[PDB]
Ligand binder design. Structure first.
Ligand code: GLA
Ligand code: GLA
Ligand code: NA
Lengths: 346, 339
């Protein structure tokens, strides 16, 4: 079933329930996921109204871009030309600049395919918006099926050579309470290397580091507490995790990551080369989620994209988008029950 | 009473009915007026869904900008520097460039004051959007009251020196049917001068012209057909009227124009110095409104703003907006019915 209602400020809330009774909801404000519940329990973080997003934190669950992550000094080279983008985090351009796509009302249309329902959000980034050459016609399709798979499909075309590397900013918290740390969740991630950050400004260091056998090694499932408790320089630098992880094997067919809590698991699939993992290292900020003060480490993202820093570390990839060329990216989050035995105590 | 409903593509339709039973409706798609009716008759042109506007014509009833009108070669000078805006009509920048603010979904909040109801639409134009320096935080408040006054109040703030001169693009048709020319309406307009167009590109010609005692003088009420049957080269040029008229006296208190058809009249008030009047000179286009095929002259606008062409005729004014300065504008469309 599909249901729609006003969500506030002119935004709408689109709620889907699949045949298994799992419900998930989105809003056109930032083509974003608002909630995902199983048996009355929230699997992710979200607010109850549009205003909350604009007043507390506009990122959760949003579609972010045109370029996700930090661009050192907002400087990009496009077809032999240097371009300076809006700098909204010191001299850095973070998640596309100020008042970016995650803050806009996107138009949308719903396609009911029976076992699958698709919500296609659309938006045009005008040429020059926040320094980005365009215009760029973008679309984000969020779909949910009877198999409990939530898929995000991005598409985009530009009138001019530009840069494009968006991502989905959902935060998971299998505890279903933001006031509960995710250190109790088990994490498995098919990545042998990571990208260290230079300092508190969080731009990339310039090197790629192997993490096998360190506290950041999750190739084999381990509790998140291991990382949180680590005194490795990078962990301390960011007070948790906030880094791009380079996937060892690419392809949408492979389970790149799996997050488990007791009988529930979320598997991550994507066609992107890295996963930026941010563990809500907010300290005592205590943003309220459903009247619960969120704790430090009260959530975890899996931002699949081309790793940030490619401006400095060419090896990470090329986020350039040629005029007329069609961009596409696909990321999938699938829900499972009793996928494995996870019986721990914190 | 207030009613909110889905207008399509995720856009909303906000309908306001006052004590008099008059109904006015708006959509966040382009902070625009969709309908205005009395006793079941539409006073303005509009569509029945969001899609239609996107597919047929996106300007009707919309808020247009940042700059309304045509800018020669898309060129403006800001703080002594030349800036090239998005060009969407040949080398001209028309109505702020392609995919402008009239095609975006604005956020909004409704405020019920009893005798009056306000609907405040907001949108942020990012710095650099379509070549315009910013960011510009814009808000357009459409309000409707028990006196049948529809008021538009504009406000904006920019982080950088820029240009700003928006307008409301409603088309009136007291016939209540697009298939019917407005030639039968009577118009009065407090303007003795106008701005002639250079040619078919519709950019300004360069001069200001006195219209006193011409087919374009409406200082004294007159029927539209007059203007429409005039052989003035300017009329002949655009096949109707598509020009900025320079108001004689400035100020919100003075009724600047009046459109009348029988018992029904619309008065226009503004704090702007000019009114651009366009008589839907669409030829055989035939755009469909409420299943009615539109006729040439099947509508008329009252675009209140600073006259287009100030880039070439500074006497017309200046549309710059310095960083940190607050822009404000107001335009009123008052409805009256004789007894
Ligand atoms: O709150 C948004 C969040 O987005 C990414 O994960 C960044 O790496 C974090 O530093 C933070 O900016
Ligand atoms: O269609 C929108 C309309 O906008 C103004 O009124 C112009 O003068 C007309 O030429 C036309 O372009
Ligand atoms: Na809506």
């Amino acid at each position: 079933s599909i249901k729609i209602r006003d969500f506030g400020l002119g935004s709408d809330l689109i709620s889907l329930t699949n045949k298994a009774g799992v419900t998930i909801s989105f809003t056109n404000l930032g083509a974003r996921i608002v909630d995902w519940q199983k048996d009355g329990k929230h699997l992710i973080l979200g607010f109850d109204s549009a205003k909350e997003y604009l007043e507390k934190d506009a990122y959760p669950g949003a579609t972010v871009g045109p370029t996700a992550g930090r661009i050192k000094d907002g400087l990009v080279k496009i077809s032999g030309k240097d371009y300076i983008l809006n700098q909204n985090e010191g001299p850095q351009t973070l998640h596309g600049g100020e008042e970016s796509i995650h803050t806009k009302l996107w138009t949308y249309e719903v396609t009911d395919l029976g076992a699958e329902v698709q919500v296609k959000f659309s938006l045009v980034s005008n040429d020059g918006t926040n320094g980005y050459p365009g215009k760029i016609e973008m679309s984000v399709t969020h779909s949910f099926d009877d198999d409990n798979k939530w898929k995000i499909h991005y598409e985009a075309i530009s009138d001019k050579d530009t840069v494009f590397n968006p991502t989905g900013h959902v935060y998971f918290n299998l505890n279903g309470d933001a006031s509960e740390s995710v250190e109790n969740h088990g994490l498995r991630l098919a990545a042998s290397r990571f990208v260290p950050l230079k300092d508190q400004t969080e731009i990339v260091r310039g090197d790629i580091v192997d993490i096998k056998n360190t506290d950041l090694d999750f190739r084999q499932e381990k509790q998140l507490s291991n990382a949180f408790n680590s005194n490795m320089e990078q962990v301390q630098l960011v007070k948790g995790i906030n880094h791009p992880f380079l996937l060892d094997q690419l392809g949408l067919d492979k389970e790149q990551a799996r997050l488990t809590l007791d009988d529930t698991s979320i598997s991550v699939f994507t066609d992107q080369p890295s996963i930026v993992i941010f563990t809500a290292n907010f300290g005592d900020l205590g943003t309220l989620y459903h009247e619960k003060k969120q704790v430090h480490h009260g959530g975890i993202t899996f931002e699949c994209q081309v790793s940030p820093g490619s401006e400095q570390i060419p090896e990470l990839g090329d986020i350039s988008l040629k005029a007329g060329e069609k961009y596409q990216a696909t990321t999938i989050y699938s829900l499972h029950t009793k996928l494995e035995h996870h019986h721990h105590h914190h």
